[PDB]
Amino acid sequence: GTYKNLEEALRNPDKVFVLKMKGTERTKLVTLSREIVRFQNLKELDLEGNQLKEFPKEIGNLKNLRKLDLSENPLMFFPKEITNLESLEELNISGTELTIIPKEIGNMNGLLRLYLDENPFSELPKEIGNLKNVLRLYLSNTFLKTLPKEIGEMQSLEELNATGTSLSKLPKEIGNLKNLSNLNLSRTELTTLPKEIGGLRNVRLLYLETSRLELLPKEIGNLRNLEELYLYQNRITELPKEIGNLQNLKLLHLNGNLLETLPKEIGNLKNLKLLHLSKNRFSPEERKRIRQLLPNCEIYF
Amino acid sequence: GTYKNLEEALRNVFVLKMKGTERTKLVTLSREIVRFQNLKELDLEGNQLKEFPKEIGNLKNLRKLDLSENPLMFFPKEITNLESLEELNISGTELTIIPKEIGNMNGLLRLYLDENPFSELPKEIGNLKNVLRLYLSNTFLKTLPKEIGEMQSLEELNATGTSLSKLPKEIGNLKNLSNLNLSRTELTTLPKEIGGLRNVRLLYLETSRLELLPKEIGNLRNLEELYLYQNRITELPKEIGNLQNLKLLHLNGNLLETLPKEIGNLKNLKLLHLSKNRFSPEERKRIRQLLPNCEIYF
């Protein structure tokens, strides 16, 4: 490990430091010193909170760099100096004002965790699918109008986060993400899910709460690996009959929807441990039926 | 005046009515309401009211009725026959639809439909030509109806928290509109017919998704305060210099890179917010130089 380098941390006794600095309130750090290539084995480099407005060209020749964090830095444009790191495991460019994601972001292709969250960009490039080794992509609280057609080309994506985005629709190609485990579309504006949502064979946790969902598609029940489903504070009026096909589902949260009845197939949910149905329009007669259908379940109205 | 009545306040020509607290359930109203005949205000805020009898409708001399925070799942048709109701506050009651017969009232002045889960407003909402203040805050409105411009007397309109993707092209026929609050909405842009809002003094469009401002916004010569902060605005129209009476412009948190040179024509602009915007130091100097009398914040 290493720490913040003042006078390059006592000449960096031998130039083999593996970690790097951070930025606090009283550390300005407008520019980076260009003696960055010397370290030769840096695996982590953190520049959190620093007032960095540009990056030098030497950042790109450090091909031994594995994690780079440029968070909370007032860089108004994405630095293409770092896109030449063909083997970077993590890139965290969050908290930086970005109107556009650079088109050559697919040149990296060795990313594992990509954090584009808290950035004011409208669109993602078609080359976002070139990052076929990425596991976690974060797009939280960004100005995304829609996910691209090529988002299903990730082929190794395990976590996709899109909270706070202006996502009106999901692309029909989203079902090609075979390795997706965590999908987060909370606080979005999805009116409905595409029928191609059933291709997400490996999804365990699906997060759709506090969104403008009116209905659930007939093909959501093809997700036999889904365990937790959060759909609360949405505008859902009914559930499809095939919702009982969720074999492994153990948590369903349906607070604040406009539900008036539930299908009789919900009693086929043998593993459903918890069912939340409060703040929904259920007549007292049907509430007895919901309790009657699932008796092993802890159910809250 | 009056208060909450136990034993119906000692047999009571009594002028006001009750309230709802923690330990007052008050499931239903008794049908002995027609007797009072001198009610001007009637408050039922917070009562766990699930139904109304039809005897409520027989009081044609009642002018204000408040049904706030009552779990009535459907709008009571019993009250729509009160043709001379000055104020209606149906807020806090879970309502999926506003009835099409709300235009039978037509004597409303202030209508508070806010905090209700209704998807659409009926086309008879324009029949209420005497309405002054309509409150639609935090409702599930995808769009205002085409007839919203038929109100003719709407002086204050609030739609905060609504899912308004667009504003109707007929919104410019509201000649008497003074207060427009479209904060926390989802308007990508304003229609060019917004220049018909001749009487608007205060326009609230903050915390929305506005990408642009139309060219006809400068036709609002009576507009004094414009709140557009925390939007997605990338540039301002050249016609922004035509807002002669504008004295407060709030533009925090947008994506602005430059301002039109016509902003110096605003002699009455006293206060300007431009913080959290993409302004280079060269352009900040020009903006301070342009409007000299204005207190400016970057």
Automatic annotation (TrEMBL), chain B:
Residues 158-229 form the Disease resistance R13L4/SHOC-2-like LRR domain. Coiled coil: none annotated. The keyword Repeat applies. It holds the Pfam family LRR_1. GO terms for cellular component: cytoplasm. InterPro entries: Leu-rich_rpt, Leu-rich_rpt_4, Leu-rich_rpt_typical-subtyp, LRR_dom_sf, LRR_domain-containing, LRR_R13L4/SHOC2-like. Gene3D superfamilies: Ribonuclease Inhibitor. Keywords: Leucine-rich repeat, Repeat. PROSITE patterns: LRR. This is Disease resistance R13L4/SHOC-2-like LRR domain-containing protein.
